Write a protein that binds this ligand. Structure first.
Ligand SMILES: [Mg+2]
Ligand SMILES: [Mg+2]
Ligand SMILES: [Mg+2]
Ligand code: NA
Ligand code: NA
Ligand code: NA
Ligand SMILES: [Sr+2]
Ligand SMILES: [Sr+2]
Length: 140
RNA sequence: GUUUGACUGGGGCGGUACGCGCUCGAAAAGAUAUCGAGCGCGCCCUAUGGCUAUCUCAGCCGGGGACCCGGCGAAG
């Protein structure tokens, strides 16, 4: 029961919301894999009337890539209870987002007979702080 | 030598109900008038057409009015 309930890392998304790019090179270094451009929507007074066009970049890491990143990334932040989602997610900072979830998450990400994850199987902030804190760092 | 139209609560002036589309008037099939009420069309587009692949939108909340992550969300 506990084995298929103990949290894990779905993905670690690192992104730099600039607003017009040349910053891909560092992400390609700090994470290890190719980043992708970020386009915006809706015209914007702040000389941002171009809908589709480079404005940011991000890198989504999974498995090892994700953990090998957090090992050297988490120590760079000072996690706090507020910094946590209602789903058991937390992001710090160049933004760094950590998406945590339980084993059979796929049930909501697959194509056939997908289904939404029952709140009971949904990760909790409490369960989140724990799991994480239970590995190289402090809380509040 | 001719023409100078029609409609119209008389005619003139005003207007066009003079060709078209929608809601209501219209009375739960269809049809249905007034110078009836609300209001549009005489285009624009080589993509703003076609198919395929991948995908889900408004709006609100939570975490780092531009961007990133998650949640709610049959359609506003
Ligand atoms: Mg004669
Ligand atoms: Mg007459
Ligand atoms: Mg009828
Ligand atoms: Na781009
Ligand atoms: Na005539
Ligand atoms: Na009159
Ligand atoms: Sr005459
Ligand atoms: Sr009279």
């Amino acid at each position: 029961f506990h084995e298929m309930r103990e949290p894990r890392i779905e993905k670690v998304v690192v992104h730099m919301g600039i607003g017009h790019a040349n910053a891909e090179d560092i992400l390609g270094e700090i994470t290890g894999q190719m980043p992708v451009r970020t386009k915006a929507k809706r015209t914007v007074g702040e000389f941002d009337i171009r809908e589709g066009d480079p404005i940011g970049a991000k890198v989504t890491l999974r498995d090892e890539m994700a953990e090998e990143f957090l090992q050297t990334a988490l120590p760079l932040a000072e996690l706090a209870t507020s910094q946590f989602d209602d789903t058991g997610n937390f992001s710090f900072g160049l933004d760094v987002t950590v998406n945590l979830v339980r084993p059979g998450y796929r049930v909501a990400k697959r194509d056939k007979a997908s289904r939404s994850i029952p709140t009971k199987h949904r990760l909790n902030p409490a369960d989140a702080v724990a799991f994480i804190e239970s590995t190289y760092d402090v809380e509040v």
